[PDB]
Amino acid sequence: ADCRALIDKLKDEQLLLELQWVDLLDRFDGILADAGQQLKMLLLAVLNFTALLIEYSSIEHLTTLLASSDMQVVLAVLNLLYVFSKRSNYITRLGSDKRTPLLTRLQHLAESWGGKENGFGLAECCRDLHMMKYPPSATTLHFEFYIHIEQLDKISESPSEIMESLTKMYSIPKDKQMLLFTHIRLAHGFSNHRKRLQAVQARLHAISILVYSSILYNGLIEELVDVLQITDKQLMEIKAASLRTLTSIVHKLSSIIDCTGTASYHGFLPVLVRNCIQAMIDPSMDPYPHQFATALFSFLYHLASYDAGGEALVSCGMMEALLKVIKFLGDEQDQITFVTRAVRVVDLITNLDMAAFQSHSGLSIFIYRLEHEVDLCRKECPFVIKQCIPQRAALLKSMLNFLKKAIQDPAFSDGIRHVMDGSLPTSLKHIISNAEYYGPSLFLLATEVVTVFVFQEPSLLSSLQDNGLTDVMLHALLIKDVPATREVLGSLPNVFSALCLNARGLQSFVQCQPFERLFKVLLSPDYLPAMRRRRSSDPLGDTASNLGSAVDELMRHQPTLKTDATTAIIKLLEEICNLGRDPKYICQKIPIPLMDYILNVMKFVESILSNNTTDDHCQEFVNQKGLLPLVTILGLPNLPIDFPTSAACQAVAGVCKSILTLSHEPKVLQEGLLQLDSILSSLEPLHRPIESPGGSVLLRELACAGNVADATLSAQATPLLHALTAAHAYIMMFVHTCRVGQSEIRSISVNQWGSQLGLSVLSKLSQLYCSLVWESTVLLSLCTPNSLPSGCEFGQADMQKLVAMAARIKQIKPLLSASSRLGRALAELFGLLVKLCVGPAARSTASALTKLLTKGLSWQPPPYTPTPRFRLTFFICSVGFTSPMLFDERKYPYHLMLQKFLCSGGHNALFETFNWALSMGGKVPVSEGLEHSDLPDGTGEFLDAWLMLVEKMVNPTTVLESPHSLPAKNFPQFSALRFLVVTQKAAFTCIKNLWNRKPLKVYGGRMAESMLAILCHILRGEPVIREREQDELHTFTDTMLPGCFHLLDELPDTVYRVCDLIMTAIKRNGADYRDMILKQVVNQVWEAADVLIKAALPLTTSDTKTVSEWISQMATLPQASNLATRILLLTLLFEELKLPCAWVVESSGILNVLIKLLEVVQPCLQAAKEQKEVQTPKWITPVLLLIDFYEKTAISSKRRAQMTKYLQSNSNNWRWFDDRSGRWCSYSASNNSTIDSAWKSGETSVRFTAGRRRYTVQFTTMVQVNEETGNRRPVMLTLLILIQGLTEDMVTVLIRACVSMLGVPVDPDTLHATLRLCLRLTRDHKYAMMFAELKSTRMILNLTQSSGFNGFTPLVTLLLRHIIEDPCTLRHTMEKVVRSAATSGAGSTTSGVVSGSLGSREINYILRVLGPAACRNPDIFTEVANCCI
Amino acid sequence: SKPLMPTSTILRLLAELVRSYVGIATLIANYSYTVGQSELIKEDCSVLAFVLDHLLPHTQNAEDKDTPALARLFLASLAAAGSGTDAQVALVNEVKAALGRALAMAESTEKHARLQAVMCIISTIMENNIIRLFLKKGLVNDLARVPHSLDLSSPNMANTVNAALKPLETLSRIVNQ
**Residue from A1084, A1008, A1080 nearest A1051 by CA:** A1008
- B13 to A1346: CB separation less than 8 angstroms, yes or no: no
Q: Across the interface, which of B16, B22, B24 has its CB nearest the CB of A1357? A: B16
3-class secondary-structure state, position A687? coil
Secondary structure string (H, E, C) spanning A1239-1271 = HHCCCCEEEEEECCEEEEEECCCCEEEECCCCC
State the burial class of residue A26 (Cβ atoms within 10 Å of its Cβ: 0-12, 13-18, 19+): exposed
Cβ count near A1095 (within 10 Å): 17
CA A579 to CA A456: how far, in whole Å?
44
Pairing mode of beta strands A1253-1258, A1263-1266:
antiparallel
DSSP code for A682: T
Would the CA dihedral through A717, A722, A724, A725 be positive or negative?
positive
* Whether the Cβ atoms of residue A1335 and residue A1303 lie closer than 8 Å to each other: no
Q: Dmax over Cα atoms in chain A, in whole Å? A: 125
**At A587, which helix (H) or strand (E)?**
strand A586-587
CA A296 to CA A271: how far, in whole Å?
12
CA A744 to CA A15: how far, in whole Å?
80
**At A1215, which helix (H) or strand (E)?**
strand A1214-1218
Within 8 A of B4 by CB-CB distance, chain A residues are 1343-1345, 1347-1348, 1352
Cβ neighbours for A593, distance < 8 A, ≥ 6 positions apart: A525, A528, A587
State the burial class of residue A769 (Cβ atoms within 10 Å of its Cβ: 0-12, 13-18, 19+): buried
**Residue from A703, A698, A702, A695 nearest A861 by CA:** A695
CA A1279 to CA A1203: how far, in whole Å?
8
Phi (first) and psi of residue A1328, to 5 degrees? -65, -40
3-class secondary-structure state, position A1275? strand
Cβ count near A250 (within 10 Å): 17
Show which of residues 15-74 on chain B sit within 8 Å of chain A, judged by CB atoms: 16-17, 20-24
State the burial class of residue A751 (Cβ atoms within 10 Å of its Cβ: 0-12, 13-18, 19+): middle
* Whether the Cβ atoms of residue A1262 and residue A1272 lie closer than 8 Å to each other: no
3-class secondary-structure state, position A1148? coil
Radius of gyration of chain A (CA): 46
CA A1138 to CA A1147: how far, in whole Å?
15
Tell me the sheet residues that pair with A1223: A1218
* Whether the Cβ atoms of residue A266 and residue A315 lie closer than 8 Å to each other: no
CA A1023 vs CA A868, A1006, A1033, A1034, A1041: distances in Å: 40, 27, 11, 12, 21
**At A1276, which helix (H) or strand (E)?**
strand A1272-1277
A606-620 burial code (b ≥16 CB/10 A, e <16) = bbbbbbeeebebbbb
Phi (first) and psi of residue A1265, to 5 degrees? -100, 130
CA A138 to CA A149: how far, in whole Å?
11
Cβ count near A536 (within 10 Å): 6
Query: CA of B89 to nearest chain A CA: how many angstroms apart?
Result: 23
Pairing mode of beta strands A141-143, A1214-1218:
unpaired
Secondary structure string (H, E, C) spanning A193-254 = HHHHHHHHHHHHHHHHHHHHCCCCCHHHHHHHHHHHHCCCCCCHHHHHHHHHHHHHHHCCHH
State the burial class of residue A450 (Cβ atoms within 10 Å of its Cβ: 0-12, 13-18, 19+): buried
Give the resolution in Å: 3.1
CA B116 to CA A674: how far, in whole Å?
83
**Residue from A1282, A1091, A1075, A1319 nearest A1194 by CA:** A1282
Inter-helix orientation angle A218-229/A268-281, to 10°: 30
Which residues of chain B come before a gap where C and the next N are over 2.5 Å apart?
127
Q: Is B80 on the interface with A (CB under 8 A)?
A: no
CA A1411 to CA A1416: how far, in whole Å?
8
DSSP code for A1227: P
Radius of gyration of chain B (CA): 16
- A1353 to B2: CB separation less than 8 angstroms, yes or no: no
* Whether the Cβ atoms of residue A419 and residue A407 lie closer than 8 Å to each other: yes
Query: CA of B154 to nearest chain A CA: how many angstroms apart?
Result: 10
**How far is the first Cα of chain B from the last one, in angstroms, to the nearest whole number?**
54
* Whether the Cβ atoms of residue A553 and residue A517 lie closer than 8 Å to each other: no
* Whether the Cβ atoms of residue B7 and residue B55 lie closer than 8 Å to each other: yes
Helix runs in A119-169, H state only: 122-126, 159-169
Phi (first) and psi of residue A1217, to 5 degrees? -95, 120
DSSP code for A997: S
CA A525 vs CA A528, A530, A600: distances in Å: 5, 10, 12
Within 8 A of B10 by CB-CB distance, chain A residues are 1341
Q: Is A1343 on the interface with B (CB under 8 A)?
A: yes
Cβ neighbours for A826, distance < 8 A, ≥ 6 positions apart: A731, A765, A768, A769, A772
Within 8 A of B17 by CB-CB distance, chain A residues are 1360-1361, 1364
Inter-helix orientation angle A307-315/A333-350, to 10°: 100
CA A1206 to CA A496: how far, in whole Å?
92
CA A66 to CA A82: how far, in whole Å?
14
Phi (first) and psi of residue A1074, to 5 degrees? -55, -45
Tell me the sheet residues that pair with A1214: A1277
Cα dihedral value A429, A431, A437, A442, nearest 10: -160
Within 8 A of B13 by CB-CB distance, chain A residues are 1353, 1356-1357, 1360
Helix runs in A582-666, H state only: 594-610, 617-623, 627-632, 647-663
* Whether the Cβ atoms of residue A1210 and residue A1237 lie closer than 8 Å to each other: no
**Residue from A298, A287, A345 nearest A317 by CA:** A345
Inter-helix orientation angle A1150-1171/A1108-1116, to 10°: 140
Q: In 3-state terms, chain A is what percent helix, strand and coil (to 5)?
A: 70, 5, 30
Q: How many residues does chain A have?
A: 1429
CA A608 to CA A522: how far, in whole Å?
14
CA A345 to CA A1305: how far, in whole Å?
79
Q: What letter represents residue A1228's amino acid?
A: S
Q: Is A5 on the interface with B (CB under 8 A)?
A: no
* Whether the Cβ atoms of residue A993 and residue A929 lie closer than 8 Å to each other: yes
DSSP code for A640: -
Q: Is B1 on the interface with A (CB under 8 A)?
A: yes
Q: How many residues does chain B have?
A: 177
Query: CA of B163 to nearest chain A CA: how many angstroms apart?
Result: 22
CA A1112 vs. chain centroid, Å, equals 49
Q: In 3-state terms, chain B is what percent helix, strand and coil (to 5)?
A: 70, 0, 30
Query: CA of A1343 to nearest chain B CA: how many angstroms apart?
Result: 6
Tell me the sheet residues that pair with A1216: A1225, A1275
CA A98 vs CA A94, A166, A384, A1305: distances in Å: 8, 25, 57, 50
Phi (first) and psi of residue A1106, to 5 degrees? 80, 10
**Residue from B68, B119, B71 nearest B98 by CA:** B119
Cβ count near A69 (within 10 Å): 17
Q: Is A1342 on the interface with B (CB under 8 A)?
A: yes
Phi (first) and psi of residue A713, to 5 degrees? -90, 0
Q: Is A835 on the interface with B (CB under 8 A)?
A: no
Would the CA dihedral through B3, B7, B8, B11 be positive or negative?
positive
Cβ neighbours for A140, distance < 8 A, ≥ 6 positions apart: A148, A149, A150, A151, A152, A187
Q: Is A623 on the interface with B (CB under 8 A)?
A: no
3-class secondary-structure state, position B40? coil
Q: What letter represents residue A20's amino acid?
A: Q
Helix runs in B41-151, H state only: 47-50, 67-80, 86-104, 109-126, 129-136, 139-144
Secondary structure string (H, E, C) spanning A6-20 = HHHHHCCHHHHHHHC
CA A1063 to CA A1136: how far, in whole Å?
8
Within 8 A of A1373 by CB-CB distance, chain B residues are 20-21
Query: CA of B177 to nearest chain A CA: how many angstroms apart?
Result: 30
Would the CA dihedral through A80, A83, A86, A88 be positive or negative?
negative
Q: Across the interface, which of A1344, A1352, A1373 has its CB nearest the CB of B21? A: A1373
CA A319 to CA A326: how far, in whole Å?
10
CA B59 to CA B65: how far, in whole Å?
9
Count how many Cα atoms sit within 13 Å of the Cα of residue A317 in the half-sphere of its side chain.
11
**Residue from A357, A345, A254 nearest A299 by CA:** A345
Phi (first) and psi of residue A586, to 5 degrees? -130, 135
**Separate counts of helices (H) and strands (E) for chain A:** 70, 10
CA A1215 to CA A1094: how far, in whole Å?
57
Sheet holding A1272-1277, edge to edge: A1223-1226, A1214-1218, A1272-1277, A1263-1266, A1253-1258, A1245-1250
- A1361 to B20: CB separation less than 8 angstroms, yes or no: yes
* E strands in A73-176: 141-143, 147-149
CA A248 to CA A302: how far, in whole Å?
9
CA A636 to CA A581: how far, in whole Å?
6
Q: What letter represents residue B17's amino acid?
A: L
Q: Is A1241 on the interface with B (CB under 8 A)?
A: no
Query: CA of A1162 to nearest chain B CA: how many angstroms apart?
Result: 23
Secondary structure string (H, E, C) spanning A1101-1132 = CCCCCCCHHHHHHHHHCHHHHHHHHHHHHHHH
Query: CA of B12 to nearest chain A CA: how many angstroms apart?
Result: 10
CA B93 to CA A1253: how far, in whole Å?
65
CA A340 to CA A124: how far, in whole Å?
36
CA A594 vs CA A481, A546, A569, A639, A712: distances in Å: 21, 20, 16, 8, 17
CA A901 to CA A986: how far, in whole Å?
15
State the burial class of residue B146 (Cβ atoms within 10 Å of its Cβ: 0-12, 13-18, 19+): buried
CA A1135 vs CA A601, A720, A1187: distances in Å: 66, 62, 12
Q: What letter represents residue A348's amino acid?
A: L
A1167-1179 burial code (b ≥16 CB/10 A, e <16) = bbeeeeebebbbb
Cβ neighbours for A363, distance < 8 A, ≥ 6 positions apart: A357, A403, A406, A412, A419
Count how many Cα atoms sit within 13 Å of the Cα of residue A817 in the half-sphere of its side chain.
13
* Whether the Cβ atoms of residue A255 and residue A221 lie closer than 8 Å to each other: yes
CA A1070 to CA A951: how far, in whole Å?
26
